[model samples]
Target: GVQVPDVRGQSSADAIATLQNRGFKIRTLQKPDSTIPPDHVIGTDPAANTSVSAGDEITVNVSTGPEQREIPDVSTLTYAEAVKKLTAAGFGRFKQANSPSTPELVGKVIGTNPPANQTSAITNVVIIIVGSG
Candidate 1:
């Protein structure tokens, strides 16, 4: 009988090599992880310390890194519009800031901390800068 090795936090290549050396067939799966870096092993299907026969297939879960989305361009939009757009784009956390601007720009969204079209993590708080007289 063979035992599955603990390969968490290991590189995919290294984990595969270690498992293969133990006579286990390797299968890989990718998932987005907030903590684990891309291409690193998150864990295994059978998990560590599982007793199994030689030649058993082991599913290695690898990290694809944190999920990212492009920040939407809400410039010149009203605060309500900006909030709607951001919420639709999967961003929930937000902070509002007021920036002095011309009469026409007043009460409209000026920009954001990370800016629009930037790829950022969904968990990041988007600072919405609004124009004020």
Candidate 2:
């Protein structure tokens, strides 16, 4: 019996080499992950340190980076409300662009660059259009 090596956080290339060297068969799988970098091993099918035969096949779950998420509709909302909505929708980065409008519309969200309901990676910075007086 052999214990599967912990390969999480290692690059896929390195993980495969390590597994092969340890007499384990390798099968790599691409999975969407927000925390792990692309092409890095997230974990194994049986997980790390599992007791198994020396010739066992280990499925390496590799990260394909963050999954795409639909942008929430923030138009007509105040700047503060837009921020809350976008953040809650998994968007971490944001940039504001202002467009001249009536006094009452000032400081309110006009739209987003990717637009509402459009799918985009959470890592991309979403441009929020604001109404300017």
Candidate 3:
């Protein structure tokens, strides 16, 4: 069994170090926030000052700088580069949503829904160029 530690409102780094000192594995989480800021700890499970077992992994949600307003355009970027760009644009490197085309276009991005230059709260939908297998 794993113990959970309360680390609410603590900076992610501080919480991680504290857990590490106690022989606990620290798990990090992220979420969209307009006020909490990024890379800062918003809260945690079991909450602060709670006692659990050692070797328990504490989960903490961190601010990644800030939430994105929408997906940035990456049509002109290469395949590898697009992945990096998407991450910078606050998107995960999930399954690639490819357009119908040849593998020749594999390294290029065609178009995206919601358009590339617009702001959208959509974090799940992203279109990258997938030319072929």
Candidate 4:
């Protein structure tokens, strides 16, 4: 039999090596962590120090770092351009608000529902305002 080590707060590479050294296979799980640095291990599924046989698999939870994102300043970008920017910024979906506009203002972004610079979790939904200042 083998015992799981305290690999919490270790780097993923380090944790893997430590566990592998004990003749254990590993399963990695990643989740957002605002505290621990990216790629660092959060913990193990067997809850560290659990006794098990050799070749057992341990699930490790790792960090992807803080997931909050500042809403980009899409106010000056055109609608299509804004969409591309938000998408590239990791937002998968958006809510659009349209207002009456002149020829010069048409197709331009007005603002966002949450405005700009607000930090939010990476997600599929965002609120967008198009045209009309």
Q: Best TM-score goes to which candidate?
A: 1
Please list the residue runs of candidate 2 whose C-alpha ends up more than 4 Å from where it truly belongs after superposition.
2-30, 34-40, 53-59, 101-106
TM-score of 3: 0.45
Clashing pairs in 2: none
**What C-alpha lDDT, on a 0 to 100 scale, does residue 98 get in candidate 4?**
86
Per-candidate alpha-carbon RMSD to the true structure:
2.9, 4.1, 10.5, 6.9
- What stretches of model 3 exceed 4 Å from their correct place? 1-6, 69-133
The lowest-lDDT stretch of 10 consecutive residues in candidate 4 is 124-133
The 10 consecutive residues of candidate 1 with the worst lDDT sum are 63-72
Better of 1 and 2 by lDDT: 1
Clashes of each: 0, 0, 9, 1
At residue 115, give the lDDT of candidate 1: 93
Q: Can you rank all candidates by TM-score, best first?
A: 1, 2, 4, 3
For candidate 4, lDDT tens digit of each residue in 47-111?
89889888999999999887867788887688788889887777767878888776677778878
RMSD of 2: 4.1
Reference-based lDDT, residue 63, model 2: 98
The parts of candidate 4 lying over 4 Å away from their true place are 68-109, 113-133
- Estimate TM-scores for all models: 0.73, 0.59, 0.45, 0.56
For candidate 2, which ten residues in a row score worst on lDDT?
101-110
- Judge candidate 2 against the unseen true structure and give its global Cα lDDT, from 0 to 1: 0.92
